[PDB]
UniProtKB/Swiss-Prot annotation, chain B:
This is Endoribonuclease Dicer. Component of the RISC loading complex (RLC), or micro-RNA (miRNA) loading complex (miRLC), which is composed of DICER1, AGO2 and TARBP2; DICER1 and TARBP2 are required to process precursor miRNAs (pre-miRNAs) to mature miRNAs and then load them onto AGO2. Note that the trimeric RLC/miRLC is also referred to as RISC. Interacts with DHX9, AGO1, PIWIL1 and PRKRA. Associates with the 60S ribosome. Interacts with BCDIN3D. Interacts with AGO2, TARBP2, EIF6, MOV10 and RPL7A (60S ribosome subunit); they form a large RNA-induced silencing complex (RISC). (Microbial infection) Interacts with ebolavirus transcriptional activator VP30; this interaction prevents TARBP2/TRBP binding to DICER1 and thus allows the virus to counteract host RNA silencing. The chain holds residues 1660 to 1848 of 1922 of the full protein. Mg(2+) 2 binds at residues 46, 131, 134. The record marks 127 as: Important for activity. It is linked to Pleuropulmonary blastoma: A rare pediatric intrathoracic neoplasm. The tumor arises from the lung, pleura, or both, and appears to be purely mesenchymal in phenotype. It lacks malignant epithelial elements, a feature that distinguishes it from the classic adult-type pulmonary blastoma. It arises during fetal lung development and is often part of an inherited cancer syndrome. The tumor contain both epithelial and mesenchymal cells. Early in tumorigenesis, cysts form in lung airspaces, and these cysts are lined with benign-appearing epithelium. Residues 7-145 form the RNase III domain. Double-stranded RNA (dsRNA) endoribonuclease playing a central role in short dsRNA-mediated post-transcriptional gene silencing. Cleaves naturally occurring long dsRNAs and short hairpin pre-microRNAs (miRNA) into fragments of twenty-one to twenty-three nucleotides with 3' overhang of two nucleotides, producing respectively short interfering RNAs (siRNA) and mature microRNAs. SiRNAs and miRNAs serve as guide to direct the RNA-induced silencing complex (RISC) to complementary RNAs to degrade them or prevent their translation. Changing residue 131 to N: In non-epithelial ovarian tumor; somatic mutation. It is found in: Cytoplasm; Cytoplasm, Perinuclear region.
Length: 171, 169
């Protein structure tokens, strides 16, 4: 191994410590990362985290005292639950530094996207960065004994600025 | 009281008795149903129910001991969480008999779909039936104090046949 080396720094950035680091490793393992022979890649956990985040965001929007009407609920959800915004948040919280892959093509797309985001429509969005925003939510869920509340404790702080920005002026 | 007349039979069909029948009424109230001026229409409950069902079905699929691959999980979820399957289940459980709306076109589309399902690509699927499969889940969630487990106690029995069938194919 060197597989889990360095993960403590990520845990500090999102403020969550894994009990079973295998979940965190799985979350960050791309299908091309053949050097990880101890867990699967992140796809199963992405499948799970995807629905988890959809539910948590939906619930938050539904409960917001601003009492959005249905068309607005729908627009807000569309704008907060999509691969592009999930990627932008992943790179904002350094997920790309712990991602594991073997892909010069991913490197290129991620690198351009990360640069472009820091200076902030035809920039290519790296879908994998959105996918690990989802997979990590799944990992946290699984690590905490299937606790939605733990996931939201971690994820709400990262999403709150866009939630507030969009809920004041809906795209 | 005019508005909730006969809802006790629906409650028996799905095996859930509402603590506050307002949520049941709201779940079945289409935006066109101008006679109801005591609750909102179903759309806010549909918004919530939609994500609730996607979570519960995703979770079920992920936990299945066959350890479906990602590709399979994704295909099963698409086959199980779509407006058409939801509309077919709503109708199978008589949701259409309690739907409140003012729209001949909608009821015509529902009638034809209900018939087509009894006779069982061409047929028009009434989106509103899928929408109220979602809204009722949202309603049960609210009525039960935002309990995901109560929703699934009601909804799993309705979905199990299709979950088991698609999961074997
Ligand atoms: Mg989703
Ligand atoms: Mg994804
Ligand atoms: Mg949905
Ligand atoms: Mg719907």
């Amino acid at each position: 191994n060197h597989l889990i080396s360095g993960f403590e720094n990520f845990e500090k950035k999102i403020n969550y410590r894994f009990k079973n680091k295998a979940y965190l490793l799985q979350a960050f393992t791309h299908a091309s990362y053949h050097y990880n022979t101890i867990t699967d890649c992140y796809q199963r956990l992405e499948f799970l985290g995807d629905a988890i985040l959809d539910y948590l965001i939906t619930k938050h929007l539904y409960e917001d005292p601003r009492q959005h009407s249905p068309g607005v609920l729908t627009d807000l959800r569309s704008a907060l639950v999509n691969n592009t915004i999930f990627a932008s948040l992943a790179v904002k919280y350094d997920y790309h530094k712990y991602f594991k892959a073997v892909s010069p093509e991913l490197f290129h797309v991620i690198d351009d996207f990360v640069q472009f985001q820091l200076e902030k429509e035809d920039i290519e969005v790296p879908k994998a960065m959105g996918d690990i925003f989802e997979s990590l939510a799944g990992a946290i869920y699984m690590d905490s004994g299937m606790s939605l509340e733990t996931v939201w404790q971690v994820y709400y702080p990262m999403m709150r600025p866009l939630i507030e920005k969009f809920s004041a002026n809906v795209p």
